Amino acid sequence: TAQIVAVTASGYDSEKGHVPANIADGDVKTRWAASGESWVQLELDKEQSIENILIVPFKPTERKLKFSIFYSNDGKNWQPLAEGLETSSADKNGEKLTFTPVTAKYIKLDTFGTDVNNWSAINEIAINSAAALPSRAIK
C-alpha cells in the first residue's frame, strides 16, 4: 500500500492509549479512538494517485462507523471523496472503498461515532491497498 508517513487527529483516548498512529501500524489489535465529532488525517510520503482505501473499524459487526472522507494536496483545502458513509457490519475483517482516482498527499476521515455510541474507533486504514477484502464503490 501507499506509505503513510504521519498521522494526526482531533483527539484520542489518552487514558487507554488509543493513539492516532495506531491506525497505521498494520496491527488489527490496536486502534485510534475518539469521542464526538472527530477526525484522523493521514499524510502520504508524496503526492500521488489514490484509488482505494481500506478501513478496518473496531467491532465492525456490532458497530457501524459514520464518516466522511476528504483529500488534499496542501493540508488546508479539502475535497470530498464521499460524505455520510457508514461502514459495513457484514464485513468481519474490513472493507476497501474504491473511487475514481484522484491525486492527493493527505487523506482525512471526519468521523461521527457509530450507531451504538459516540466513539469513533478504527483499527487500520491503508491507501491503495491490495488486500483481499470486499470492496465497495463510493461517490
Q: Which stretch binds Ca ion (CB under 5 A): 23-31, 58-66, 71-79, 106-114?
A: 23-31
Q: Which is nearer to Ca ion, 34 or 72 (CB)?
A: 34
Phi-psi sector, 65: left (phi>0), alpha (psi -120 to 50), beta: beta
* Smallest distance, Ca ion to C-beta of residue 31, A: 6
30 binds Ca ion (CB under 5 A): yes
* Smallest distance, Ca ion to C-beta of residue 28, A: 6
Q: Which three cell numbers stand for residue 95?
A: 472493507
Phi-psi sector, 35: left (phi>0), alpha (psi -120 to 50), beta: beta
Q: Which is nearer to Ca ion, 22 or 52 (CB)?
A: 22
Q: What is the CA radius of gyration of the chain?
A: 13
22 binds Ca ion (CB under 5 A): yes
Q: What CA–CA distance (Å, rounded) separates 24 from 9?
A: 12
Q: Which is nearer to Ca ion, 72 or 111 (CB)?
A: 111
13 binds Ca ion (CB under 5 A): no
**Beta carbons within 10 angstroms of residue 135's beta carbon:** 13
Question: Where does this chain bind Ca ion (CB under 5 A)?
Answer: 22, 25, 27, 30, 123
